[PDB]
Ligand binder design. Structure first.
Ligand SMILES: [Mg+2]
Ligand SMILES: [Mg+2]
Ligand SMILES: [Mg+2]
Ligand SMILES: [Mg+2]
Ligand SMILES: [Mg+2]
Ligand SMILES: [Mg+2]
Ligand SMILES: [Mg+2]
Ligand SMILES: [Mg+2]
Ligand SMILES: [Mg+2]
Ligand SMILES: [Mg+2]
Ligand SMILES: [Mg+2]
Ligand SMILES: [Mg+2]
Ligand SMILES: [Mg+2]
Ligand SMILES: [Mg+2]
Ligand SMILES: [Mg+2]
Ligand SMILES: [Mg+2]
Ligand SMILES: [Mg+2]
Ligand SMILES: [Mg+2]
Lengths: 227, 945, 258
RNA sequence: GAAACUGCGAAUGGCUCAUUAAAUCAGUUAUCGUUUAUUUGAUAGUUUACAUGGUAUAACUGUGGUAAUUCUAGA
RNA sequence: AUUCAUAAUAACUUUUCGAAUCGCAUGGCCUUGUGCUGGCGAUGGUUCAUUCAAAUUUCUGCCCUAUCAACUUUCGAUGGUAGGAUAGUGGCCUACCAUGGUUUCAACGGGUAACGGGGAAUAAGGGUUCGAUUCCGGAGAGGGAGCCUGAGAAACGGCUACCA
């Protein structure tokens, strides 16, 4: 079966077609998350460690973690699970999914390089893929560059250059959770609003109390007159 | 903002801010070509507009105004006879400032002036005063339309009273000064446009009076107001100038060069020229060009020589030389100016000429251009040549500027030696100025400074400074410099055994002088105190790279076997460059010594060369991991082990997160090579923030050199270049402070990041067993509470302490540490900290001690820490006679932890209903405790007091 | 239905809006608001079918988004905002203030008022009760809650609310001899003076009202709105002064003025 | 300003009369027997801060399975 | 009319809320600091009230059939007590209790080509018949069964079984 091996440190990944059944059989009976020794797979993988993460069968159905069977089964999938994207809020769909036990009928098996062996793979270890995007939140920028609190993130924003024909310029992200005078003004206005509300309520309560006391006094006077 | 609504959406209705409307608004009624009501008249303009406004506006104020004035406006003669009452009512209703009714009133006011123009003159002053109050009132309540109505009415009055107002425009301007000088930019801008129409209509004779008055006024926002007013007057249409622009420019010019006019007037003229030059095309500007050039020729004089010079700088800089048709004319003007002043102005002029002039003209005049610089700018030629290099260095070289610099060096040689040191000091770093370095020097200095070098007293830093600037020049010397340098070298080592920061830099400067073995011996005699300095390393690197290997050098290297190891200490420094030179330096010593360079050294050098960017972020990580794998795989000697491990800690000092990932993975698998060394490196980094690192460096005698190099300009483009020129001038004015400051900038970095302790803590966490063995050195921090120190000078951050406590819990046998009981007691102190996370960390370390009784109750103690299960655990675990209650035999051991835990929970700010209930619970379990155990809790509360 | 409805058929719309039965199939459904659906006049009907200022719904929306309409001194931008009885509608650009008062026929009438009259409205006290923290409050017929009411104010009284500040200026007690306005039943829109209030515990109270012409009619208390003392209303009344007039005389005076 | 996340709507409208004989429905009551998005009005000084995390992912980059679907696996 | 509104005391909570949000604009104080303060709006948030609604509910009112006279109650039928569940009342369900409840004033059962009404036709009046069908209300989405989401669904141009 095909093997989709990913080296996450480099972010690289490549496929290997397999014909001999010895490596395929040492892959048999394993489970997603278990580790296998690359040398059993082949000399090119001597010294490597492969973690099983999933795969697809001869009919394309994916493997699902948590179901411990070597055969397909129809499972009722919901929000926030693999192998299913709900179209409608609260939607649940029962779909056939392959079990988590490796078997002969797996068309492709996905592997993650846990540890690098003595030899270097041409397409995985020898190449690197840069990250597509850089940090956006201010604290993430500081963490990435190890900046101090006094140092301003504004000067350490990663900028990417774009050329359109002969024209050229640069683009940078919008930081969120950046301390700006507008946020301070909003906080101050909110505090002032709440304080003023409290004072107004106290004044109104006091005036009502005075009115009640005056009415109470005059009615008591009238009762005294009646006596 | 900066990306204004250039691309409009498909929405039919869009929101627009008041500032947006104001910015787009422009006061010029004539451009509007829409049909106007007053164009068609049967009786009068006022009546024609009066009936229409009755139809459209229904405001209460306008309705009241209409009724009062309806009867008296039926005919033009009736309006004339009743003009007084009509104007009073119009003024009265406008003062109410009712926006619903302003538009009809303001329009009618203009049409009122239209009917009886010459008669309106007696009303003129009141009408303008009313508008000024309205526009001032309009600032309070936002409405862009109100401003549009008001200023168009002002513009209309100007159009109808154009003849009379022009005769006394100075009076009209006098009324509008509050508007032209108002704080708001737009109110001044709008008024300027309205007054601009009158100016373009003026006769030349009347204009000359007006320009004189405003320039007299110029001697807040008035300068900007005049700037907008005049530039609007000349500009008529896109890439085109008004026909009258010739006379206005000529009249503005003649006054500006007139001695009586203030210098601000010429600067005002300069700012005008930038605006119109930018606005107008070449063809529209040709007629304007000739009038100045003729006037400059006609009015050239000694008194106005500076003023003409300043405006000429304005022309050359404006849009570079693109707008200038014929540079040859300017060159003739420049020659006439030189034949008939301020040095700085010319330096600014010629430098811009070099950059902006066409190639053909400069070829004809480059030779005369530089000879003039030697003629008068020879006093400040260095400031000039620097500015010329910054503007266009390549052009200066092409036109033989270096040769003239040689002549300047050989002409003004004695008076400004130190300035030459500053200039050549600044230009070394730039590679493009390599040709300037290749310039040969006049020999007479190289004898003179050498003569002082042969007999120089060095007993204080002040004496040392004298050699430094002479040393900087001496590098270009060709007269066998090595023989002279060496005697000074032994002198400086002998006189200052313990160098300061400044002394180290000079030694590198002195080494930098050397050009293609004894001097190698001299540096080897005293290098332990100079390895850290970057300049010293660079000079040493240039030396050894120059020397060719031979058996004699092998003997020199043999005499000092500890050389290689000592240099390894540099790899812990916070500076990338210093490490790189040490790597380059270390390699060539291996060539001179003949010992084979390990491949690890080459690989580490490559890593330093890789830029620190997100694109290269991953690439850096693999390289560090790969070399680490190589280092672990291949057995090596102590030097390689000392090399690589120190280099790894150097990578921690780097401020790039990907670098940290590689080293943090590499170090735990390679520390076994030298466990003692790695601990020393970790220990040092922990103590670096506590250690106070201050760069103490010589301060030369302060120089009071400062002056206004150039005039101030409102336009940003000219001002920035002026600031650049002045910065160079100020730098050269104080040569001692400039020379000394430049050295500081290029010295390098010595201040470790304050977080460096955190990096070492991560290393310690990854390898607890090393910390456990070496607990002796790390013990004091716990007993000091991680506070330097009764007032506390500094203390560890909360994150740092948290990582520290993790390491303690990870020790395999905490019980057998150097001071277990004292650590155990202090872990008691942390167990009761108000922060529950600290308490959990302390408990984990306490559970690291193997005690059978505590293990029996390990779960209950943990549950007490957890906020969710805190309440139920108290009732089940601590209830007297409970099934799960602590046994009496084990009560002695567990109870102190229980009491101290509850103490921390008791310190929570009892601030929310859940939190308040928590404080009530912790006090309510006290009666369950025996009285001796109740007593100790009270003691714990009183211990802090 | 599985939830709240959002459409209103023209035939099912309130009769007093006077909507064409063939203009379309649907009528404006008043959104939730101060007044009930059947006792409210949406702004679209008022601006289009009554004032004729707008020719269709879209133009009404254009007017509203320009923020030219104010209800009780507040700008409203909802086409189907349920303006109702004793509501003040202010148009500054046109300079009018309208008070929504039923005519004798039982329909909301275009009644223009002065600014000083537009500064205040009237509210029937639907409820009085102590709120949280022991703060008394009164709920009026238009959903306004006013805290710290005058203690003498009780249910069925009328309170003069100042729009700018939303506070009670004066009040009228519900007593015999008071001037009242009918807001329901086939006597809707009439005006008279209270004569007697018949009470039935556990049932609907009945009120006898005498007009200026000496005619008497009985109406449930829920449809009575005190508007002042006899001869001294606190608001300007529409033409006809809430007097019901017969059909024959209607023919008569139409002929006379014609 | 595509895509995606987020919020709202999709329980309105339109169609048909199968079941249903105190059921539906009409009129007339009650909630002191309860839920109520939204509108409208009131209503909260008692709760590193110049502002916290991934305990995190989509869109996106890239490697793939299935004959096939508004299928989706690994990184 | 209330154990109502509200308030108070003592504790309780895998226990909430009490603004880490956004647009436009740049005013006022000064000890001149990117110091302090400050405007017009949007979106959220506890509780109360109002509104749109929902749920249940009190009384009266349905065509033919007595050659349908007794029905309901074992497996809730009538009612009491306690609990569970419900947004909530309530045999709605559970456990223990009693033997109750409707009926010749037609229960119960059967038929209905029975969705109900506003209305339509005819007639002199009484009546007879029609009303799927422009509005109101109820039920459904081939037939039964069960559900996530959401304020609101037992939704079907949402999901899951079984039957065809
Ligand atoms: Mg952009
Ligand atoms: Mg009642
Ligand atoms: Mg969504
Ligand atoms: Mg049927
Ligand atoms: Mg039946
Ligand atoms: Mg019934
Ligand atoms: Mg909504
Ligand atoms: Mg609200
Ligand atoms: Mg992923
Ligand atoms: Mg019960
Ligand atoms: Mg039972
Ligand atoms: Mg029928
Ligand atoms: Mg029907
Ligand atoms: Mg349905
Ligand atoms: Mg069908
Ligand atoms: Mg269904
Ligand atoms: Mg369908
Ligand atoms: Mg449907």
């Amino acid at each position: 079966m095909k093997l989709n091996i990913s080296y996450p440190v480099n972010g690289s990944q490549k496929t290997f077609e397999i014909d001999d059944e010895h490596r395929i059989r040492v892959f048999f009976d394993k489970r997603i998350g278990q580790e296998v020794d690359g040398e059993a797979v082949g000399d090119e993988f001597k010294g490597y460690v492969f973690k099983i993460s999933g795969g697809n069968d001869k009919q394309g159905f994916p493997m699902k973690q948590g179901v411990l069977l070597p055969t397909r089964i129809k499972l009722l999938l919901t929000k926030n699970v693999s192998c299913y994207r709900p179209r409608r809020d609260g939607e649940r769909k029962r779909k056939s999914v392959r079990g988590a036990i490796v078997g002969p009928d797996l068309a492709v098996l996905a592997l993650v390089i846990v540890k690098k062996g003595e030899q270097e793979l041409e397409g995985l270890t020898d190449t690197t893929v840069p990250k597509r995007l850089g940090p956006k939140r201010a604290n993430n920028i500081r963490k990435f560059f190890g900046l101090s609190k006094e140092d301003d993130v504004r000067d350490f924003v990663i900028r990417r250059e774009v050329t359109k024909g002969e024209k050229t310029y640069t683009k940078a992200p919008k930081i969120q959770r950046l301390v700006t005078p507008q946020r301070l003004q909003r906080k101050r206005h909110q505090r002032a609003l709440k304080v003023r509300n409290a004072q107004a309520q106290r004044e109104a309560a006091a005036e009502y109390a005075q009115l009640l006391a005056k009415r109470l006094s005059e009615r008591k006077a009238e009762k005294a007159e009646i006596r | 903002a900066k990306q204004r609504q250039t691309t409009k959406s498909s929405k039919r209705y869009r929101y627009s801010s008041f500032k947006a409307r104001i910015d787009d608004l422009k006061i010029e009624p004539a451009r509007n070509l829409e049909k106007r009501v007053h164009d068609y008249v049967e009786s009068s303009h006022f009546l024609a507009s009066f009936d229409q406004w009755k139809e459209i506006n229904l405001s209460a104020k306008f309705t009241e105004f209409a009724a009062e004035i309806e009867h008296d406006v039926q005919t033009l003669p009736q309006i004339l006879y009743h003009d007084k009452k009509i104007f009073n009512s119009l003024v009265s209703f406008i003062n109410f400032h009712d926006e619903f009714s302003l538009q009809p009133l303001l329009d009618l006011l203009a049409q009122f002036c239209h009917d009886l123009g010459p008669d309106f003159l007696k009303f003129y002053e009141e009408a303008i005063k009313t508008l000024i109050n309205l526009l001032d009132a309009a600032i309070e309540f936002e409405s862009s339309n109100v401003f549009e109505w008001g200023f168009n009415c002002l513009a209309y009055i100007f159009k109808y009273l154009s003849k009379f107002l022009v005769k006394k425009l100075v009076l009209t301007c006098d009324l509008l000064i509050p508007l032209l000088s108002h704080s708001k930019e737009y109110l001044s801008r709008f008024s300027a446009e309205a007054l601009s129409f009158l100016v373009r209509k003026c006769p030349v004779s009347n204009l000359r009076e007006f320009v004189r008055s405003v320039f007299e006024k110029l001697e807040t926002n008035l300068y900007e107001g005049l700037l907008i007013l005049f530039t609007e007057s000349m500009t008529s249409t896109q890439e085109t100038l008004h026909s009258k622009a010739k006379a206005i420019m000529s009249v503005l010019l003649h006054e500006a060069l007139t001695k009586s006019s203030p210098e601000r007037s010429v600067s005002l003229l300069s700012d005008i020229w930038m605006n119109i030059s930018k606005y107008a095309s070449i063809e529209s500007l040709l007629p304007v060009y000739e009038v100045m050039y003729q006037d400059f020729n006609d009015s050239l004089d000694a008194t106005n020589i500076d003023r003409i010079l300043k405006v000429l700088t304005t022309i050359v800089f404006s849009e570079s030389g693109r707008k200038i048709p014929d540079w040859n004319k300017i060159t003739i003007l420049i020659e006439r100016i030189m034949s008939q002043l301020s040095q700085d102005k010319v330096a600014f002029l010629f430098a811009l000429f070099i950059r902006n002039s066409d190639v053909k003209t400069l070829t004809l005049f480059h030779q005369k251009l530089f000879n003039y610089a030697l003629t008068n700018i020879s006093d400040c030629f260095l400031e000039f040549f620097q500015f010329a290099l910054r503007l266009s260095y390549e052009r200066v070289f092409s036109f033989n500027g270096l040769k003239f610099l040689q002549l300047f060096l050989k002409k003004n040689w004695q008076s400004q030696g130190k300035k030459i040191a500053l200039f050549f000091l600044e230009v070394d770093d730039k590679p493009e100025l390599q040709k300037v370095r290749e310039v040969n020097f006049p020999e007479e200095f190289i004898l003179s400074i050498r003569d002082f070098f042969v007999t120089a007293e060095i007993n204080d830093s002040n004496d040392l400074f004298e050699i430094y600037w002479r040393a900087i020049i001496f590098k270009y010397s060709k007269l066998q410099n090595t023989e002279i340098i060496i005697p000074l070298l032994e002198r400086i080592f002998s006189t200052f055994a313990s160098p300061d920061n400044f002394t180290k830099d000079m030694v590198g400067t002195l080494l930098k002088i050397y050009r293609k073995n004894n001097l190698l011996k001299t540096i080897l005699d005293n290098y332990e105190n100079y390895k850290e300095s970057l300049n010293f390393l660079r000079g040493w690197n240039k030396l050894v790279s120059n020397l060719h290997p031979s058996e004699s050098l092998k003997g020199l290297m043999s005499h000092y076997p500890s050389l290689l190891l000592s240099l390894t200490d540099n790899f812990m420094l916070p500076d990338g460059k210093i490490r790189y030179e040490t790597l380059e330096l270390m390699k060539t010593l291996m060539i001179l010594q003949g010992m084979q360079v390990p491949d690890l050294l080459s690989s580490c050098m490559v890593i330093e060369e890789i830029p620190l960017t997100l694109q290269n972020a991953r690439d850096l990580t693999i390289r560090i991991k790969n070399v680490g794998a190589e280092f672990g795989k291949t057995k090596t000697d102590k030097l390689v082990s000392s090399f690589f491990l120190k280099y790894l800690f150097g990578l921690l000092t780097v401020r790039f997160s990907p670098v940290w990932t590689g080293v943090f993975d590499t170090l735990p698998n390679v520390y076994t090579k030298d466990e003692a060394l790695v601990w020393k490196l970790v220990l040092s980094f922990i103590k670096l923030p506590d250690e106070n690192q201050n760069l103490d460096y010589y301060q030369p005698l302060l120089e009071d050199g400062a002056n206004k190099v150039l005039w101030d300009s409102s336009v940003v483009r000219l001002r920035d270049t002026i600031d650049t020129f002045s910065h160079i001038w100020s730098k050269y004015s104080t040569q001692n402070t400039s020379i000394i400051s430049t050295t500081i900038e290029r010295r390098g970095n010595t201040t470790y990041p304050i977080l460096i302790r955190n990096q070492a803590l991560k290393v310690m966490l990854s390898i607890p067993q090393v910390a456990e063995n070496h607990f002796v050195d790390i013990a004091p921090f716990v007993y000091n509470d991680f506070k330097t120190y009764r007032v506390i000078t500094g203390s560890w951050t909360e994150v740092d302490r948290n990582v520290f406590l993790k390491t303690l819990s990870k020790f395999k046998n905490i019980k057998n540490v150097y001071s277990a009981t004292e650590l155990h007691d202090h872990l008691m102190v942390l167990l009761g900290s108000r922060n529950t996370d600290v308490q959990k960390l302390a408990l984990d370390a306490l559970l690291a001690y193997k005690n059978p009784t505590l293990n029996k109750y390990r779960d209950n103690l943990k549950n007490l820490l957890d906020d969710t299960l805190f309440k139920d655990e108290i009732t089940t675990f601590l209830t007297e006679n409970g099934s799960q209650s602590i046994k009496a035999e084990d009560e002695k051991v567990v109870m102190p932890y229980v009491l101290r835990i509850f103490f921390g929970r008791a310190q929570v700010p009892p601030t929310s209903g859940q939190k308040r209930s928590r404080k009530i619970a912790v006090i309510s379990v006290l009666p369950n405790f025996k009285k001796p155990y109740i007593n100790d809790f009270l003691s714990l509360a009183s211990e802090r007091l | 239905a599985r939830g709240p409805k959002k459409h209103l058929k023209r035939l099912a719309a309130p009769h007093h809006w006077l909507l064409d039965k063939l203009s379309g199939c649907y009528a404006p459904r008043p959104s939730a608001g101060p007044h009930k659906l059947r006792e409210s006049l949406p702004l679209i009907v008022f601006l289009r079918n009554r004032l004729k200022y707008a020719l269709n719904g879209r133009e009404v929306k254009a007017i509203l988004m320009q923020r030219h309409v104010k209800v009780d001194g507040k700008v409203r931008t909802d086409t189907t905002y349920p303006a109702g009885f004793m509501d003040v509608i202010t148009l500054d650009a046109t300079n009018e203030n309208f008070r929504l008062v039923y005519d004798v026929k039982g329909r909301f009438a275009v009644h223009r008022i002065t600014d000083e009259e537009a500064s205040y409205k009237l509210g029937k006290v639907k409820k009085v009760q102590l709120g949280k923290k022991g703060v008394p409050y009164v709920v009026t017929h238009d959903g306004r809650t006013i805290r710290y009411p005058d203690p003498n104010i009780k249910v069925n009284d009328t309170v003069k609310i100042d729009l700018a500040s939303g506070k009670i200026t004066d009040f009228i007690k519900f007593d015999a001899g008071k001037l009242v306005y009918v807001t329901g039943g086939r006597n809707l829109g009439r005006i008279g003076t209270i004569v007697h209030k018949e009470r039935h515990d556990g049932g609907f109270d009945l009120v006898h009202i005498k007009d200026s012409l000496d005619n008497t009619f009985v109406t449930r208390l829920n449809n009575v709105f005190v508007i002042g003392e006899q001869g001294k209303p606190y608001i300007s009344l529409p033409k006809g002064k809430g007097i019901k007039l017969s059909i024959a005389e209607e023919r008569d005076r139409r002929r006379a003025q014609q």
